[PDB]
Design a protein around this ligand. Structure first.
Ligand SMILES: O=C(O)[C@H]1CSC(c2nc3ccc(N4CCCCCC4)cc3s2)=N1
Length: 432
């Protein structure tokens, strides 16, 4: 061993009661009441949407879906590239306890089928450009009984938009600010079904998102709740990195600036013009910005951190990127789809080259001997194992693949090789 088991410190605020939908509802209502509070900004088209707008459309979607008949026995799919509308049905469903399975908007038809065959959605929200794939998947999966278009105001090609669907199902005199999100068992009600790294379905109870919201506004393990904080996120919303940072930024009242096609100039200009304080990159963009020479042309003085996750960041490209951006280091974190979000996180300003962080509040982490199972001590390399309240509840209708991952005592076996050091910073070893 127990000197060799690394434990998450204490959360700076304790763990809120209520479902993830109740916690989102309460914060967003608060932001909704101050006019002009920006929730999302689309860098390509330059449009802002406020928390008032976001809050009111999510509450209406929640009530419409409820009046349509969806409940905890149901799942919806959200199949769209990152967009201003992406999170409206996501929030709507969380408010009423309907599980959300976000679908890779660039899966081809076959991966979409396999994804939605596991998720078995009753309703699909889709962007215009994904409709024809969903219609082909629907032919094979008639459990899809209702298709709603996300990025339209009017009806589109015979299908309702979110806005016409909402009107079709709101009671007269619906009041967005009197709406009360559903109360339910957060341990037992699934919030998200996420796709596995042939893909599997990862069920995440509302609880795992609630713990994530603790980290997100933790001053050491998340971000400080400070007005006019803006984040430029270039990560897919349909995977856990983008899903659970974005929901955390919404809980925090941040301005989330998005882009879904990378462009060097647009990214750098958006950093500058939106006075971005924190940038979110997928790791292959780190290899890009190690090569970019245009960074010094831009006023990046507001930039406090560049965050990384989800894949291997080497000590080399990280140091290269930090220098091109004149930052102390890279702020990094480690988790799996099966782990909700990041379980190891660089504490703010406690950055170390090559390390992905320390054990987050509520969790524990060890490295075990690849042959026996016994717990190792400082700087010994073995398998990375973790345990805590963000671990998935299981794979959708795949119990053997679940139990091959978590022992009877609840340790998730990362399948990664790791060590921790004298300050308890963790390091992931590339097997190659
Ligand atoms: O690679 C994966 O499978 C995915 C599963 S979810 C995940 C990560 N989620 C997150 C969520 C948050 C972060 N942070 C950015 C780094 C500094 C602040 C801590 C959160 C890093 C990661 S990495 N990576």
């Amino acid at each position: 061993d127990a000197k060799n088991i690394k434990k998450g410190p204490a959360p700076f605020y304790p763990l809120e009661d209520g479902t993830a939908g109740e916690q989102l509802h309460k914060a967003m209502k608060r932001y909704a009441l101050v006019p002009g509070t920006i929730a999302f900004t689309d860098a390509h088209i330059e449009v802002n949407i406020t928390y008032a707008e976001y809050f009111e459309m999510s509450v209406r979607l929640a009530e419409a879906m409820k009046r349509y008949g969806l409940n905890t026995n149901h799942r919806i799919v959200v199949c769209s590239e990152n967009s201003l509308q992406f999170f409206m049905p996501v929030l709507g469903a969380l408010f009423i306890g309907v599980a959300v399975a976000p679908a890779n908007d660039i899966y081809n038809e076959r991966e979409l089928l396999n994804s939605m065959n596991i998720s078995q959605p009753t309703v699909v929200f889709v962007s215009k450009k994904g409709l024809q794939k969903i219609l082909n998947v629907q032919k094979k999966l008639p459990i899809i009984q209702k298709i709603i278009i996300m990025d339209s105001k009017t009806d589109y090609q015979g299908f309702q938009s979110m806005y016409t669907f909402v009107t079709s199902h709101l009671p007269p005199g619906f009041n967005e600010y009197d709406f009360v999100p559903e109360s339910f068992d957060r341990d037992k009600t699934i919030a998200l079904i996420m796709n596995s790294s042939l893909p599997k379905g990862v069920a995440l109870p509302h609880r795992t998102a609630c713990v994530r919201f603790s980290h997100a506004r933790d001053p050491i393990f998340g971000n400080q709740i400070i007005p006019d904080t803006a984040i430029l996120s270039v990560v897919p919303f349909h995977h856990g990195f983008g899903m659970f940072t974005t929901l955390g930024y919404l809980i925090c009242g941040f301005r989330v600036v998005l882009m879904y096609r990378f462009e060097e100039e647009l990214f750098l200009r958006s950093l500058q013009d939106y006075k971005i304080q924190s940038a979110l990159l997928v790791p292959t963009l780190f290899s890009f910005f190690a090569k970019s020479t245009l960074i010094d042309k831009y006023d990046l003085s507001n930039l406090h951190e560049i965050a990384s996750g989800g894949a291997p960041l080497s000590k080399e490209v990280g140091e290269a990127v930090a220098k091109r951006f004149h930052l102390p280091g890279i702020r990094q974190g480690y988790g799996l789809t099966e782990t909700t979000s990041a379980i190891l996180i660089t504490p703010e300003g406690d950055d170390k080259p090559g390390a992905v962080g320390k054990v987050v509040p509520f969790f524990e982490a060890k490295v075990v001997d690849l042959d026996t199972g016994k717990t190792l001590g400082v700087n010994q390399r073995g398998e990375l194992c973790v345990r805590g309240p963000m671990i998935m509840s299981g794979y959708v209708n795949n119990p053997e693949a679940t139990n091959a991952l978590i022992d009877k005592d609840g340790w998730l076996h990362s399948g990664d090789i790791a060590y921790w050091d004298e300050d308890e910073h963790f390091f992931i070893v590339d097997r190659l």
